[PDB]
Amino acid sequence: ETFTVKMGADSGLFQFEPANVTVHPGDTVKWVNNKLPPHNILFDDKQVPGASKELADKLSHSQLMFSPGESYEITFSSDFPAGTYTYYCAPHRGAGMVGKITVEG
Ligand SMILES: [Cu+2]
Ligand SMILES: [Mg+2]
């Protein structure tokens, strides 16, 4: 299954919508640039399973995304450990633009 997360709330707020998603290994999370771009996707190395900067870097899309509707996807392959993965948008981190993916094995 693919789960879609909007970057920017439809109403014009600095949020991932929905904030929290639960997936199964093999599933895909697709981020779609929605409102008030740019945004990016940075995983917090302290809040991914195994507390790994390498894992967080692999998952991240650090470059800013400006075009309405453009997308970035991660498919949660077996390489990636089950557990919770917290991420944020760098330019809007203080605004509370944070989200979480729970990979349930
Ligand atoms: Cu943002
Ligand atoms: Mg469930």
Looking up tokens 């990016």 gives 40
94, two tokens: 């203080």
List Cβ neighbours of 80 (8 Å cut-off, separation of 6 or more).
25, 55, 59, 103
46 CB-contact burial (10 Å; exposed 0-12 / middle 13-18 / buried 19+): exposed
Of 24, 61, 65, 89, catalytic: 89
Q: How far is CA 65 from CA 4, 9, 20, 98, in A?
A: 16, 15, 21, 16
Strands 13-17 and 2-9, by their bridges, are: antiparallel
Identify whether the C-beta of residue 35 lies closer than 8 Å to the C-beta of residue 12: yes
Of 7, 24, 39, 65, catalytic: 39
Q: How far is CA 48 from CA 9, 11, 57, in A?
A: 24, 30, 11
**What is the Å distance from ligand 1's center to 75 Cα?**
21
List Cβ neighbours of 101 (8 Å cut-off, separation of 6 or more).
20, 21, 22, 23, 29, 76, 84, 85, 87
Task: For residue 61, indicate whether it is catalytic.
Answer: no
Is the previous residue joined to 38 through a cis bond, with omega within 30 degrees of 0?
yes
CATH number at residue 96: 2.60.40.420
Q: How many domains does the chain have?
A: 1
CA 89 to chain CA centroid, nearest Å:
8
Where in the sequence is the domain holding 74, given as residue range(s)? 1-105
To one decimal place, what's the resolution in Å? 1.7
Please name the method used to determine this structure: X-ray
Task: For residue 92, indicate whether it is catalytic.
Answer: yes
